[PDB]
């Protein structure tokens, strides 16, 4: 059986509670700032390790949604006192940007304006051809990072244009 | 002959192949083994304690077996066993205690 | 907790040196005095930990390593370091 794994960070400390009746089982996460609880059915059995801050699950109910239950649970906790990050690049001749207080100005051979404006993000320039975004939610980040990508993306003939710093890149010959 | 039959239970019942570290502690299993030996060594007339001390120095020089734990060929002190068997044999031994008996004060 | 550490020691040396640091030295010691067999480790930017192995798995360990390796990027990229690989190293 697939025995899914629940990570817990190190800043977090947790407890596990049951009734005398033993018909209810739930779990309690608690940090300096936040606190969060969630239960387990009578058909979900559980194993814990303080050695790793990992928890293991079996499901007699055979529900396939749990694989999504993990990623929410895992990332929702690492969303406490930690960022998510991402990096963007470009390579080209008549390309540039300018950065002013989470307001990024893009000039990539287009007649129209191309301002990027970040609501509740962090943006810090490391070089002319590189910029990092930082935010606590991963899902807003990609929506924030990809808008930059859609202005210019990698040509399949030359790796000229913008791209993420970790991605599948395509290439195709041209003008041998 | 009733001893051989009884003995083979207790070694079986204490076959515990767990790896060990030689320490002061011992398993409750091993204690059933030791306690059965002492129950047999206590209830023996003195003509027999004489004999057992003679058996060992016929069995220890034979030393069929190598180990740093048990009896061992490379055990150093085996060669003396042929000479001395009982300290009551050495008449010098009889001098020591009466000599020491007067040295307590 | 023995055999789990056997396999890790191979992946530290049997593995490829490109994807390791240059000063990477893995060892093995028999410590009878320990409570349990352990996997001590040391990272670049200061981090250091130990993971006992009498109860765990090889999979529960890797997500801990990701919980460090994902952050060291967030630390070193801010310093300007490109800790990334060329695109031409592995195709599909």
């Amino acid at each position: 059986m697939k025995r899914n794994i629940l990570f817990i960070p190190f800043n977090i400390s947790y407890s596990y509670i049951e009734k005398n009746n033993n018909t209810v089982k739930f779990l309690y996460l608690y940090n300096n700032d936040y606190f969060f609880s969630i239960n387990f059915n009578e058909k979900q059995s559980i194993v814990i390790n303080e050695d790793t801050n990992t928890i293991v699950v079996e499901t007699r109910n055979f529900n396939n949604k749990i694989n999504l239950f993990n990623n929410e649970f895992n990332k929702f906790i690492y969303s406490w006192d930690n960022f998510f990050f991402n990096k963007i690049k470009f390579t080209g001749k008549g390309f540039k940007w300018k950065k002013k207080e989470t307001n990024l100005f893009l000039f990539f051979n287009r007649a129209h304006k191309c301002f990027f404006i970040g609501n509740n993000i962090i943006l810090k320039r490391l070089s002319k051809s590189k910029v990092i975004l930082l935010k606590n939610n991963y899902n807003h980040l990609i929506h924030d990072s990809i808008l930059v990508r859609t202005i210019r993306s990698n040509n399949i003939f030359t790796k000229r244009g913008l791209r993420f710093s970790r991605q599948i890149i395509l290439k195709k010959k041209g003008k041998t | 002959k009733x001893f051989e039959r009884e003995w083979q239970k207790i070694q079986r019942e204490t076959e515990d192949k767990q790896r060990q570290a030689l320490d002061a502690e011992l398993t409750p299993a091993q204690k059933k083994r030791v306690e059965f030996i002492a129950d047999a060594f206590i209830e023996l007339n003195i003509m027999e304690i004489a004999y057992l001390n003679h058996t060992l120095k016929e069995r220890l020089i034979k030393t069929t077996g190598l180990s740093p734990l048990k009896v061992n060929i490379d055990w150093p002190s085996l060669k003396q066993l042929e000479n001395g068997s009982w300290p009551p044999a050495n008449p010098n031994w009889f001098l020591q205690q009466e000599a020491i008996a007067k040295l307590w004060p | 907790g023995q055999n789990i550490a056997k396999q890790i020691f191979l992946k530290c040396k049997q593995a490829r040196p490109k994807y390791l640091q240059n000063d990477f030295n893995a060892t093995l010691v028999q410590d009878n005095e320990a409570p349990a067999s352990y996997f001590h480790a040391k990272f670049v930017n200061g981090y250091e930990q130990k993971w006992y192995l009498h109860k765990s798995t090889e999979e529960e360990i890797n997500r801990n390593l990701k919980y460090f390796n994902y952050q060291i990027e967030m630390e070193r990229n801010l310093q300007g370091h490109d800790d990334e690989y060329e695109d031409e190293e592995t195709q599909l």
């Binding site: 190190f10 | 060990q20 570290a21 030689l22 398993t27 | -």
Partner: peptide
């Protein structure tokens, strides 16, 4: 003398910098 699971062995667990600190 044989494998008994320990009781009080857990080391410190490294604390990471918070975004305020960083």
């Amino acid at each position: 003398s044989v494998w008994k699971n320990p009781t009080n062995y857990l080391p410190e667990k490294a604390k990471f910098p918070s975004p305020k600190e960083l």
